[PDB]
Amino acid sequence: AFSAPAAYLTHQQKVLRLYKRALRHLESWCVHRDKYRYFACLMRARFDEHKNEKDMVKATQLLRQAEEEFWYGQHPQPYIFPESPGGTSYERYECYKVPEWCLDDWHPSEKAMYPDYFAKREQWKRLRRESWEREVKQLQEETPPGGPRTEALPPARKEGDLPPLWWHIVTRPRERPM
Amino acid sequence: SFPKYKPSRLATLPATLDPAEYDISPETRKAQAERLAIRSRLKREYLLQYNDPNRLGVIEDPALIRWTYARSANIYPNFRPTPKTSLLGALFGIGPLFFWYYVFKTDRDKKEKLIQEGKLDQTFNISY
Amino acid sequence: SGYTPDEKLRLQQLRELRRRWLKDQELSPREPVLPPRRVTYRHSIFAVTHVLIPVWIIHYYLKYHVTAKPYTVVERKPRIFPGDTILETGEVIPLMKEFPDQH
Amino acid sequence: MLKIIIPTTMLLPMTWMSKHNMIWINATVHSLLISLISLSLLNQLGENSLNFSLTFFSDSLSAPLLVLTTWLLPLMLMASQSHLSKETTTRKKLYITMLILLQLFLIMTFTATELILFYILFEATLVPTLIIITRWGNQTERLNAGLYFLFYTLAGSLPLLVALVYIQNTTGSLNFLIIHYWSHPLSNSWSNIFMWLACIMAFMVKMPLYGLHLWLPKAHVEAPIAGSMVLAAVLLKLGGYGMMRITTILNPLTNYMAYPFLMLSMWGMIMTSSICLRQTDLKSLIAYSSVSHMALVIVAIMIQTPWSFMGATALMIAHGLTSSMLFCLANTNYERVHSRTMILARGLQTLLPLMATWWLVASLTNLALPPSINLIGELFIITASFSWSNITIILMGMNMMITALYSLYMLITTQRGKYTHHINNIKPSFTRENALMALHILPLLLLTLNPKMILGPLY
Amino acid sequence: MNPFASLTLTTLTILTIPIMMSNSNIYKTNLYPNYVKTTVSYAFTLSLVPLLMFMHTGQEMIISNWHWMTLQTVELSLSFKMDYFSVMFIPVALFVTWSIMEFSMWYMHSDPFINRFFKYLLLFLITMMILVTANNLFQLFIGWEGVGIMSFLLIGWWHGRTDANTAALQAILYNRIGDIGFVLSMAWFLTHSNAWDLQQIFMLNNECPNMPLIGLLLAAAGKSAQFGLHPWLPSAMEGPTPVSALLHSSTMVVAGVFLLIRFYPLMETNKLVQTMTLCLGAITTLFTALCAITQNDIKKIVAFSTSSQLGLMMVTIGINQPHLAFLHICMHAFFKAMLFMCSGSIIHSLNDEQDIRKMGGLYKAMPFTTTALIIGSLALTGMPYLTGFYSKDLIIEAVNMSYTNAWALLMTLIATSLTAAYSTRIIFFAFLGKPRFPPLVLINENNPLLINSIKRLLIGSIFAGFIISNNIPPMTVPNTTMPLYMKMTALIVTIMGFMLALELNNTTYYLKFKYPSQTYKFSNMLGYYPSIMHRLPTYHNLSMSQKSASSLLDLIWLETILPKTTSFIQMKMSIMVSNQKGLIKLYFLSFLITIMISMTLFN
Amino acid sequence: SDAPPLTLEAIKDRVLYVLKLYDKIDPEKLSVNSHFMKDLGLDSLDQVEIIMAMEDEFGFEIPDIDAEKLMCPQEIVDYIADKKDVYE
Ligand SMILES: CCCCCCCCCCCCCCCCCC(=O)OC[C@H](COP(=O)([O-])OCC(O)COP(=O)([O-])OC[C@@H](COC(=O)CCCCCCCCCCCCCCCCC)OC(=O)CCCCCCCCCCCCCCCCC)OC(=O)CCCCCCCCCCCCCCCCC
Ligand SMILES: CCCCCCCCCCCCCCCCC[C@@H](O)O[C@H](CO[C@H](O)CCCCCCCCCCCCCCC)COP(=O)(O)OCC[N+](C)(C)C
Ligand SMILES: CCCCCCCC/C=C\CCCCCCCC(=O)O[C@H](COC(=O)CCCCCCC/C=C/CCCCCCCC)COP(=O)(O)OCCN
Ligand SMILES: CCCCCCCCCCCC(=O)SCCNC(=O)CCNC(=O)[C@H](O)C(C)(C)COP(=O)(O)O
């Protein structure tokens, strides 16, 4: 999620992803813990038979018939964690996520309550404001000519600098705002 | 061997079952690198416009304007009378009208004939 | 694999900034500064403000307005059985035909 | 009837002589007072009509339309007061003058004891609307829209005038009362067929019919908020009023000639309801919904039964109010967003809950939820069509299903989901917008208590 | 005078006071849910009086209080019907709703908009009470639409979730499909019987034709989620557990069945519609049970069980036993609501975990939920002298001892077996094995609200069947004589299902793994009906709505015919006429030609 | 919910507990900053098994792109703390 994607997936990444999917779907098939442990160790042994293989064409032939076999026996109703992109509580709390700038439109009678919070917010806004001009310059001087090649942002290199484009990553509402 | 999965329009081919992915080549790698470079440039532009504290408005999205304009205002100037278009327009704009006209006309002539012969039993039929 | 050193440093800085923001989200003990300004017993009052008054209003509206017009309230004409007597008339429904009673 | 017309005429001098910062207040107050005055026309009789004089008369079909027309002006002023803030005093007074002239023309049109006077006012209502659309419009296409909104209308209305005068040469009077009392059957002839067409298509073009509905999306999209309100709420009902007034002399030729228009409306309601499903514009979607509802009204009028007429009147009133509310909500979104696209701004219920409630109520009343008068009119028309022929129920039910689908689609796309991240200029809704929504919605839920007030003369 | 009317209107009237007070100050405090729960409990204990009067005397009423618009010879008025059905269903619904709000007090403890949730629940209850007591078709339609709109609002309670909005729109779509038939029935009844009142409709239809009954059957299939329009009920589990327990399990989803109960005088005079109803119920219950017996989400299993019970109710209606179907509604509300409450308690205890693969040993970890779920499953499958027996046993006997179709009876028996199968599946997979939840144990039941709400419905699910069966008057001829084997058909079928499903489930412990068969894939994917029917039609509609309706006709051909052709013709004629080079020779020659033509043509 | 507000101390305690139950690692040789591929001599498949253990222990699944580049327990606790927004 946080880490920037790569231009492509290597063979080891693909085999690791297949291993993850196969073990998860095997756990979905094998409800009980001991049965899952036995069959997962059996699957690990089946996977590590060809670990030391060197031929790239034969390696590509491998993992492909494995993906086909996985698709044939992929447990059409697999287990999904509640907050996962397929879970029952994937986006339950997205209706309670309110942006930070909404507080700028509060009535003064509402800002009369919670004065310390708005003072700290003022310090945060000043820090963002002073910081922003420098961040743009860093991005301008650090970005390779011809535009970025990978959507990875550099860290702050000086003392008083801050990571470029940090405001909307630091100011996420919450995971469970209410 | 196992039974083969057959792709369809509403059930597309899985990502891990595409024969094209496993046919890796330097040209394909270069194409993917260029695609990711384009995506990275667009994302960098969007974030530069997004994190700016001075901005107090929406960020105009030329893709969205292009989509809406092509959907609404760019249809007729690119239209050409073609046997496909002429036939499809005639069908979908004339056939249903005549079909429903025939259906309702047949039903109403049947009802009128039954009324004229008097064998309809319209007792308690007061509101119309 | 793993994090690159620049990724490590950026994650560290962003994480410390996020922790500072989260700590700043907390409330002081005086934060809700509420300004004050004005201008069996629970069940006992509830049963008279939520039941008794609605029954009074509905009973009045039914007995004195709805029943004024004809056919607004129609009964079922309760069942009449042999051996019963009617209050209005006082006459007694005659008994049945004395079928043979056995088991 | 002059007790309503004269104050509307005095609204002009008052606006011009009004202080440079007090035009809106005076206009709103006096327009609301005039609406209160016009409320008295609802007291109708089971007898003929309220014949005030030789020139103007009232009826229980004209009375609800007159009340709605008088009520719309304060809402139009409240909606227009927002986007005309940076505008010079003379031109704001000109805008208010156009609104007042349109209201006066509509009020005189809805009484119109004579058909030539009705035609004159019915075509006089065109000029202020065209000026409003082509002057105070945002996009460059407004001019084109105006042209369309003009010529279509005239393309239908010029033959009507000829037919009208021809009738006066044969009948001898175009007065509605004499025309009703001295009506004679139309022989099935080519000349009578063409006279029927000349009398009918003028009102069919403004409803609009499915074939002749092209001008409406353009006119509604490019017009300002007040123009959209007046077009959707009142100007579409002129065709229905004219048809109900003029179909008396068209019998018995109406039975044969109603078939093409009945088929066109019964299929175009489905076509426009389906078009609403795939739409990237809020105003266009509302316009197509208006087209569908007016197609149902056309079916009702062509069926020509008492239940048909009652449902038609109720549906016109309800649709006017509902479409005005929907356009107002869309304009409130646009004034913050400046894009007028459904998919751009999302999840507004999180940021504006009360406006989300207003959106929900508007969508529900457009969905024809009972016991709203929308449902009353729809059900009366459906029952009359079923009596006309039992097979219409399939198309009617399909239309109801697609209507519910696109209404809830409009609600969910704009109110539910996750908010757009980069949009930060979404300020809290003002008291004016909320008051506009409340003043739009409360009359509907009050009229559902007294349906007979809007059921027309055949009640 | 005659307190029956005053009480039976006062219950519904006092059900609406918290809606009035929702704009008051109490709505902004945390005592609002307690206010609503107390109001509902008082309404239930107040409605217990008309039930007592009916049981004593058999007293029935019609209260036509307010006069709405009158349309020529048709009169519309606010009329309430207080027959056996209304005065019996109101107390059960109020009891279930009281239990549901008491449970939601604890289940929605952390929800910021809990007062709005309770207001929505009360509004749904008000709309359902309007639906049940309606005496004319317009008021019944008002309730029909109110319950649907409230279901739409409550399914999409978490409006930030895409799937919740999708499920709400799905439910609206299917309910409008039923609305088509409902409106058809209304139109036919007004056109032919000249009224929407129940009395006039019953009087003027001695032999009811096919069309109004087919419309009523379509509406009932739409609202009760029969086989043709089933998937919306499984998909409605996206809403909060109290919503699934109240609306989509016990009260709202029976409404369509109730409709067919209301028109039973017209139902018995038609044979084709009865056969259609019986076949639809049989196929629905079979298909839903078969889909249920292989699901992993507990809420999905309970919803499919509810749909199977609805199919059984429709079969009972089809075999000309409306009163028995009403009794089944009454018992099913009790035990299915309590079952859903147990499911919600388990769900909350395991940190919002719904799949049964992560639920292990709970027989000892949570005992009260265990005993409540066991009692509920026993009542649902049918244990003699329990609340489910007095209904389902008579259902089976009536099906066996009457002139029906063989296939419908076979599918009813197989559906009973599959009901036992999924009940034992739930119990085995959720209560018997070793624990499989995450290590951080947060299991807790020490809360009086949940315990009281569950135990009230427990006492109901144990005693209410006997009390109600022995209290109501006899409404049908009993099957007093029976074959000995056919007397025990339901019991042996249920026991066989229990034993076979337990034996099949016990083989999961075996250290052997085999790929699934085609039948398992068909049953797990809901017969593949949700895939095809939610991908093939919709696309084929939406595409058309942009290709033919929007672009081809509206934007191109309708534009080409009238405006564009006129513009092109006028432009061409203007160009031709105005393009004169200014040479007087050509104009003079044209004038000479015109003079010659005038001299040679106009004389 | 009624869920206690877990802290990084608890998260690191649970992570180290899960790693100590891993019999392939000697508990007395493991450390908070101990690397997986080098300091503990673990294969990539063992790393993804550790990721699975963390997912089944914390009740949420880490995306594969983030999981495949987590190399020490300290980064795992840091990532989980960022995911759950842990204060102290
Ligand atoms: C007159 C005397 C009366 C007495 C008669 C005799 C008494 C009873 C005799 C017993 C007869 C059979 C009973 C055994 C049932 C089978 C259970 C079984 O072994 O399942 C495992 C086995 C496969 O397991 P798996 O794939 O390895 O699953 C992996 C794990 O187990 C995954 O496991 P999991 O943890 O995920 O979940 C486990 C779950 C998942 O298991 C499943 O996958 C369920 C799927 C099969 C079971 C469903 C059986 C219900 C049959 C209703 C069909 C109605 C007609 C449908 C028409 C379809 C047309 C294509 O299994 C269960 O929980 C229990 C399943 C249901 C068994 C208990 C109730 C059934 C007994 C009642 C049947 C008749 C007695 C009625 C009594 C009334 C007196 C008349 O199922 C089968 O091999 C199928 C066996 C029978 C299926 C017949 C349908 C075949 C349709 C093909 C085409 C046919 C021609 C159509 C031509 C159309 C052209 C137009
Ligand atoms: C484009 C979007 C919609 C716009 C509006 C469209 C609706 C307008 C259509 C008008 C309705 C049809 C016009 C005439 C209908 C009369 C009935 C006729 O169709 O039936 C037969 C008529 O026979 C033939 O139709 C003869 C006419 C054929 C010539 C018409 C052209 C046909 C297609 C042209 C359509 C173009 C219309 C739009 C022009 C701009 C019956 O034969 P007969 O009993 O002997 O005649 C009875 C009438 N009498 C008694 C007066 C003599
Ligand atoms: C939005 C665009 C819609 C355009 C509307 C056009 C439809 C109206 C019909 C065409 C115009 C006809 C106007 C006639 C006015 C009524 C007068 C009348 O009917 O009197 C007839 C006259 O009838 C006619 O002359 C009509 C002839 C039509 C001439 C103009 C043709 C215009 C185009 C016709 C084709 C289109 C037909 C359908 C158009 C529908 C619109 C799409 C009797 O004549 P007498 O000599 O007095 O009889 C003595 C012997 N008994
Ligand atoms: C119920 C679901 C059924 C699913 C069925 C799935 C069937 C699986 C069968 C698998 C068959 C194979 O072995 S396919 C074998 C694919 N080819 C290779 O593995 C060659 C080189 N392998 C690598 O480089 C890896 O990364 C490795 C060294 C292993 C680790 O590396 P790390 O050092 O970075 O951990």
Side-chain angles (χ1 to χ4, degrees), chain E residues 373-393:
Chain E
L373 191 123
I374 288 294
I375 294 190
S377 306
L378 287 184
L380 162 66
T381 49
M383 195 91 273
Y385 317 123
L386 274 210
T387 202
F389 160 83
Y390 288 95
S391 152
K392 204 174 127 293
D393 163 270

Side-chain angles (χ1 to χ4, degrees), chain D residues 351-372:
Chain D
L351 315 172
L352 311 158
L354 200 63
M355 215 42 107
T357 295
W358 294 130
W359 273 100
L360 162 72
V361 183
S363 295
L364 281 200
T365 208
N366 177 44
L367 180 140
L369 196 70
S372 79

Side-chain angles (χ1 to χ4, degrees), chain A residues 131-146:
Chain A
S131 187
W132 168 261
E133 204 59 14
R134 201 156 57 260
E135 295 177 33
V136 171
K137 195 45 190 169
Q138 167 174 356
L139 282 185
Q140 207 146 27
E141 67 190 1
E142 198 153 351
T143 278

